[PDB]
């Protein structure tokens, strides 16, 4: 027949229901068998290797306020809620891996590609085992409209929050000098195939209470983890890794939550900057990134202690929009996806107002505005082959901003100066878009990158000149973020799109197909099973078997 690993991957990775699989096994076995596939209890017994709580490890130095037991599998994330009626309810169900263990397993799964990258380097083996550096992109994103199960309890809200990480790179430093030396780098970080779920909850993003209860332990894990280095026995030899954690993958509403910022249409628009709406309307293209964790924490202590007995209206100016204590650090970085969606829906709005003559007659009614939307969408479908939309998905946001789509909505606006204007605007946008959305603009799109600031300059000048009526005292968060802090970001990182929300976000699709086909399904067990099965979906060891060396 075949080895149970190949069998397992050929189950996990083609999405076969266990009962579906076993159905097939019985069939191939009975008819002309000489059974090929391996039975279920021997896949399950081939399983325990790939999940966490298996490979032994040790941390130097020992981790702060964390158990030293390395065998722990899927843990109910409630994490000791005493469920006393007298206290806050235990309502929410969750399951999570103990973060460090999820890590070492995730990573020892890369032992293959790390040793093969090491041999590509032709690098020394016995020497320089310990100088490693590991960079982990983590992401947390919520999901609504999830029905629930009748079940025995406890009562729980509809919406579900999926906290996940992915290993972006791993590199080496020793002996010294030599920058640091990449070994492994995720080739398609936006694939579902690489995103590792860690915590699964049923929670609404809105309630902060249970979100911080269940993600609290996780944070103490990272924070207590940064200082230590991990010691893993791999390729026969124990080796010490340093982990550098960048949370890059959040939507801004949730960034604003985790950092105590007021949200999301607030006068203080920038997560990374202190400018108000008006001051960001005046000078668009010139800004300097300030906001980060440590200063947000000191900022809150000012808002609370308030040593200058200053009044609220003005106090909020002095702390510059921080009303709450941030419970997590996220790197000061933009998200690519909702940037693309935010700008796309913007130009959808400008087009719409531009059909009708907005700047001649400044005060349109509900009805002319609804009618403008009707001719706009009718035209887009008629030529660009794009149906009208409920909400702007980034996929309609990619077919919306192209020169073709603009030139199909150029036919609409009678004024021949305006066609010039919005047409040239859109070309400015296509010139600056790849800058943030490509993986490493330093290579793929260098000449757009070097021209970005100047390019955004003609853009903002073009808005504040011709379109000003719409931009005078109001600018979307994203236009500002994208016309201001991107050169600074790619200088600091070098990449934006690679850190985008996709891999978290896109993985939600899997979650839905795992709450239906591979669920248990009852309230108690079922998160455990979605989570396990996710972890397998996303492991490399299985996916290596896909090509089968072509």
């Amino acid at each position: 027949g075949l080895h149970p690993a190949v069998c397992l991957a050929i189950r996990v990775n083609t999405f076969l229901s266990c009962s579906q699989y076993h159905k097939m096994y019985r069939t191939v076995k009975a008819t002309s068998g000489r059974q090929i596939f391996q039975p279920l209890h021997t896949l399950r017994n081939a399983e325990k290797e790939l999940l966490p709580g298996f490979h032994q490890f040790e941390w130097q130095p020992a981790l702060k306020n964390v158990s030293t037991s390395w065998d722990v599998g899927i843990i109910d994330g409630l994490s000791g809620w005493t469920v006393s009626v007298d206290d806050v309810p235990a309502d929410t169900i969750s399951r999570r891996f103990r973060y460090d263990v999820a890590l070492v397993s995730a990573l020892k799964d890369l032992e293959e590609d790390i040793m093969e990258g090491l041999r590509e380097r032709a690098l020394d083996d016995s020497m320089c085992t310990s100088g490693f550096t590991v960079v982990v992109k983590e992401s947390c994103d919520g999901m609504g409209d999830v029905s629930e199960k009748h079940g025995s309890g406890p009562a729980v809200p509809e919406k579900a929050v999926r906290f996940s990480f992915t290993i972006m790179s791993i590199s080496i430093r020793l002996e010294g000098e030599d920058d640091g030396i990449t070994i492994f780098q995720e080739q398609k970080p936006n694939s579902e195939l690489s995103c590792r779920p860690l915590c699964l909850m049923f929670v609404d993003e809105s309630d902060h209470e249970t979100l911080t209860a269940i993600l609290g332990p996780v944070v103490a894990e990272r924070k207590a983890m940064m200082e230590s280095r991990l010691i893993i026995s791999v390729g026969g030899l124990l080796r010490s890794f340093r982990f550098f954690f960048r949370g890059t993958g959040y939507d801004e509403k949730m960034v604003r939550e985790m950092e105590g910022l007021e949200a999301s249409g607030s006068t203080y628009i920038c997560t990374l900057c202190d400018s108000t709406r008006a001051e960001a309307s005046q000078n668009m293209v010139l800004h300097s990134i300030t906001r980060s964790h440590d200063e947000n924490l000191e900022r809150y202590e000012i808002w609370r202690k308030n040593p200058f007995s200053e009044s609220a209206d003005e106090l909020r100016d002095r702390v510059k929009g921080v009303s709450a204590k941030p419970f997590m650090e996220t790197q000061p970085t933009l998200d690519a996806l909702h940037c693309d969606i935010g700008n796309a829906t913007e130009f959808y709005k400008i087009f719409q107002d531009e059909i009708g003559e907005v700047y001649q007659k400044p005060n349109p009614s509900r009805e002319e505005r609804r009618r403008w939307r009707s001719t706009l969408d009718k035209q887009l479908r008629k030529k660009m082959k794009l149906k009208p939309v409920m909400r702007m998905n980034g996929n309609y946001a990619r077919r919306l901003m192209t020169r073709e789509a603009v030139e199909a909505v150029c036919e609409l606006v009678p004024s021949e100066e305006r066609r010039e204007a919005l047409l040239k605007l859109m070309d400015l946008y296509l010139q600056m878009k790849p800058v943030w959305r490509s993986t490493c603009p330093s290579r793929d799109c260098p000449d757009q990158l070097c021209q970005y600031s100047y390019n955004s300059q003609q853009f903002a000048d073009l808005l504040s000149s011709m379109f000003k009526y719409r931009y005078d005292g109001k600018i979307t968060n994203y236009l500002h973020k994208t016309l201001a802090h991107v050169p600074e970001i790619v200088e600091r990182d070098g990449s934006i799109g690679a850190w985008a929300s996709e891999g978290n976000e896109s993985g939600n699709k899997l979650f839905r197909r795992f709450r239906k086909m591979n669920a248990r399904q009852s309230k108690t067990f079922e998160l455990e099973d979605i989570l396990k099965h996710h972890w397998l979906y996303t492991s490399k060891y299985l996916q290596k078997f896909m090509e089968a060396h072509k």
């Binding site: 158990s67 722990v72 103990r98 009562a155 103490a220 609370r304 009303s323």
Partner: protein, 351 residues
Amino acid sequence: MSLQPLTAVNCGSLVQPGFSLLDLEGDVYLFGQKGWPKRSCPTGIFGVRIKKGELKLRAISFSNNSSYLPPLRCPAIAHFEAQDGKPECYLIHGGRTPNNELSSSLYMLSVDSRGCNRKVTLRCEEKELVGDVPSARYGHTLSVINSRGKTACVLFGGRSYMPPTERTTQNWNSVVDCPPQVYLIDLEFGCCTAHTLPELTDGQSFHVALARQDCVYFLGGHILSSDCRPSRLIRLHVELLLGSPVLTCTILHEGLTITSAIASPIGYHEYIIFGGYQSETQKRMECTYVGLDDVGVHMESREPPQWTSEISHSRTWFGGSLGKGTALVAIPSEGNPTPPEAYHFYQVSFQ
């Protein structure tokens, strides 16, 4: 005795299962909004007015003198009445914030200015505490005592999070009763003394404190170690004599078994205890009246208002006392599609 339904009108998303009602100078102010304060009302505190069945919440505004307060869930409130120097105070300590940590910092909340038009500004003065600090805890209770004639305060009870040795990210979210050492906090200065007594074997939680005339009666709370709901009533008697605050205690024959009770003052010192719970499963419907006198505290049950089958059948319920023998209760409500308002309310009144 009576109760009548209340429509929460707009903005019933503010209330969370623990919360606190501050009754001072007539109107009472809700406290401990769900989540972090929204810039609709950044202060965090709401005046509440109940008119013709409608329950309306208004946005208070602090004075410039004040520190701003996080929405603590289940703190120890001790109302300190009017006298020199600066009446009248609500001592709030320390609860637990909308992130999960315990404040362990005492705040003093007072009225400031009015109206002009039906408007009340407030001021919050946090006070530094040197010691012998109280351990950060929640669901403990705090009370105001006056011995000849100096006024001090008594702080006891409550859970806290597991100490940072046994603290583990799998047990991180557990709690435990913090140890039984009363803390005598002078209002000013900030000196907190920690005493213990052989009569107190264990710490409690949610135990309703009554305080009059240099004596403090703790009703039966909920002990987490042996999981009993003591029917032993606890009394203690402190007198402050230069230069030590000497302290004594006694157990009582009989005390109530109820946790998470609502004490609504009606008479001079007479309160009506509603009670949250008889046992872990089954909530207390019975309504009780509790007076206290120098001889002792005298207990008389009064006929409880007839409960609509809803509140008689609801698994959990809470509320606060508007004072003047008037109080509010709150029932979670399951419905689909979402109400959205999560809590039906009822106003209850004595006589």
